[PDB]
Amino acid sequence: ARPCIPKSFGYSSVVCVCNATYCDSFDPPTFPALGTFSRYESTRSGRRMELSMGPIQANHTGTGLLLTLQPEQKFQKVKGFGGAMTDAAALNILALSPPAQNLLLKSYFSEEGIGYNIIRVPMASCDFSIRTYTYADTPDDFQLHNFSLPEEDTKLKIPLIHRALQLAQRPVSLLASPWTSPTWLKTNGAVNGKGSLKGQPGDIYHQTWARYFVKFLDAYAEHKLQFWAVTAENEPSAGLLSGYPFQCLGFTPEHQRDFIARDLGPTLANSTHHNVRLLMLDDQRLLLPHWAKVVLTDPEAAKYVHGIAVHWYLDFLAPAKATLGETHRLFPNTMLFASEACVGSKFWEQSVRLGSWDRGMQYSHSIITNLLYHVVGWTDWNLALNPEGGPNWVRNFVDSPIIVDITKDTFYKQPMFYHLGHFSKFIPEGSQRVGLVASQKNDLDAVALMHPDGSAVVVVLNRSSKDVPLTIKDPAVGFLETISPGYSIHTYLWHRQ
Numbered sequence: 001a002r003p004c005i006p007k008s009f010g011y012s013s014v015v016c017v018c019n020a021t022y023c024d025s026f027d028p029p030t031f032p033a034l035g036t037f038s039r040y041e042s043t044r045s046g047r048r049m050e051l052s053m054g055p056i057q058a059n060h061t062g063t064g065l066l067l068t069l070q071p072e073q074k075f076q077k078v079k080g081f082g083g084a085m086t087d088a089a090a091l092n093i094l095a096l097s098p099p100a101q102n103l104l105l106k107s108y109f110s111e112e113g114i115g116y117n118i119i120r121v122p123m124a125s126c127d128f129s130i131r132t133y134t135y136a137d138t139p140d141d142f143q144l145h146n147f148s149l150p151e152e153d154t155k156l157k158i159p160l161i162h163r164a165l166q167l168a169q170r171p172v173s174l175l176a177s178p179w180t181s182p183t184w185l186k187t188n189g190a191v192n193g194k195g196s197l198k199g200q201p202g203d204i205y206h207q208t209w210a211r212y213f214v215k216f217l218d219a220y221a222e223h224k225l226q227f228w229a230v231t232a233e234n235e236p237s238a239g240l241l242s243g244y245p246f247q248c249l250g251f252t253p254e255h256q257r258d259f260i261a262r263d264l265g266p267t268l269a270n271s272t273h274h275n276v277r278l279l280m281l282d283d284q285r286l287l288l289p290h291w292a293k294v295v296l297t298d299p300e301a302a303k304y305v306h307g308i309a310v311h312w313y314l315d316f317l318a319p320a321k322a323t324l325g326e327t328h329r330l331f332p333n334t335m336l337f338a339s340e341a342c343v344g345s346k347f348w349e350q351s352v353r354l355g356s357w358d359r360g361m362q363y364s365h366s367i368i369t370n371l372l373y374h375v376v377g378w379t380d381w382n383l384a385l386n387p388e389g390g391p392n393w394v395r396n397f398v399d400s401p402i403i404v405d406i407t408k409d410t411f412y413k414q415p416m417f418y419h420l421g422h423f424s425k426f427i428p429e430g431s432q433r434v435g436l437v438a439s440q441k442n443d444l445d446a447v448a449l450m451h452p453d454g455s456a457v458v459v460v461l462n463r464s465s466k467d468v469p470l471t472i473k474d475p476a477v478g479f480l481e482t483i484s485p486g487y488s489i490h491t492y493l494w495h496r497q
């Protein structure tokens with residue numbers, strides 16, 4: 001339908017410019033015959049998810065790298081892709097005029113956009129909020145009579161989530177995570193800093209905090225929104241650090257284990273929300289496998305834990321094998337899910353870099369690495385930020401795939417958006433990762449999955465400056481002859497029958 005309007009801000013690639021009357025968009029999906037493939041291509045040079053078609057042929061004319069689909073080798077099924085509806089994201093979206101708001105949400109959620117099916121929802125305030133608050137700030141309300149949703153939920157997040165669901169290509173799953181409890185439940189009586197829940201698992205503080213999870217779920221249910229999952233705490237390890245500047249609530253893995261076993265699991269299980277899934281950790285990958293061992297080797301905790309939620313800060317190293325790989329080997333029946341990613345966080349990096357091809361590559365590279373190590377979904381942080389990386393009540397420090405300029409009723413879609421879209425648009429829930437064998441050593445990142453209807457999807461990322469001649473083989477169909485240009489990403493799709 002509508003092409004990217006490119007704008008350069010001096011970085012390695014362009015953003016695509018959207019406003020109240022224009023945004024780039026796709027036509028409805030259209031299914032070419034067996035023996036034809038579809039290719040979507042983005043490039044640092046400015047191509048943005050451009051569609052082309054070609055033959056899958058009986059003969060094989062390439063003599064370079066071969067990637068062979070191995071459909072009989074089955075790995076994990078995919079839950080989904082999305083991002084976080086923080087206060088900051090919501091403030092930014094709602095700063096646009098209604099037509100521009102609709103074009104932004106369609107970009108993320110519709111079939112005319114990139115088909116997101118996950119939204120992460122903070123339970124009250126975090127750093128990406130313009131003030132500190134929880135849902136129960138009235139002290140010593142252990143029964144949570146005065147628990148309530150503020151305007152950040154009722155006016156900003158909830159209406160936006162409704163509108164996202166309405167435009168959604170696919171059913172969307174909501175995931176909730178708390179940063180801090182009420183400060184009267186905390187050892188340090190503060191929203192941030194080194195402090196945990198008061199007392200010990202099983203006690204009044206621990207029971208009220210678990211009840212707060214149910215009150216939250218009740219409150220959202222009254223606004224006709226239901227959750228797929230909750231995490232046991234956002235980044236529990238953060239609340240163990242002296243001076244931690246952002247809302248937090250510290251748990252050791254042992255404290256998390258015991259809170260889940262004694263309070264949170266039993267409380268959720270005894271509620272009307274017993275079908276909500278509980279994810280543990282929700283923290284950096286270098287905490288694994290140790291946290292998984294602590295929590296999941298205790299049957300009393302393990303029985304309430306559906307999965308392990310992981311974060312990563314993409315500017316940092318964290319070898320996937322020793323963390324994700326080992327966790328899967330030790331606990332092969334507990335799903336791994338990536339619940340937050342971000343980029344730009346080092347002191348010297350600009351928070352927002354409009355058109356950074358590098359940051360797009362960091363996104364797609366991380367998704368590929370996650371899918372190659374058993375992870376069933378991948379969730380961005382803020383859906384949108386302002387050009388400074390805000391608002392954040394502490395400090396702006398990370399980027400976002402959509403940047404809003406309210407002064408101009410415009411938003412920019414960063415390379416990150418299209419790199420995420422190369423996966424999110426083309427990997428519906430219930431797609432399954434399958435074998436894809438590289439015939440020789442190479443500089444590409446690639447992953448193959450099979451849609452629920454049996455059709456193939458392959459993503460090929462080239463983070464090098466050099467074009468790579470490539471043949472993709474599907475045993476049931478033939479040979480797809482192609483080229484992965486330097487600094488490109490492609491998604492190939494095809495019927496197998």
Ligand SMILES: *[C@@H]1O[C@H](CO)[C@@H](O)[C@H](O)[C@H]1NC(C)=O
Pocket residue numbers: 005018019020021022
């Ligand atoms: C919105 O963008 C389109 C396409 O670039 C352009 O034709 C139009 O001028 C824009 N609207 C405003 C008010 O600048």
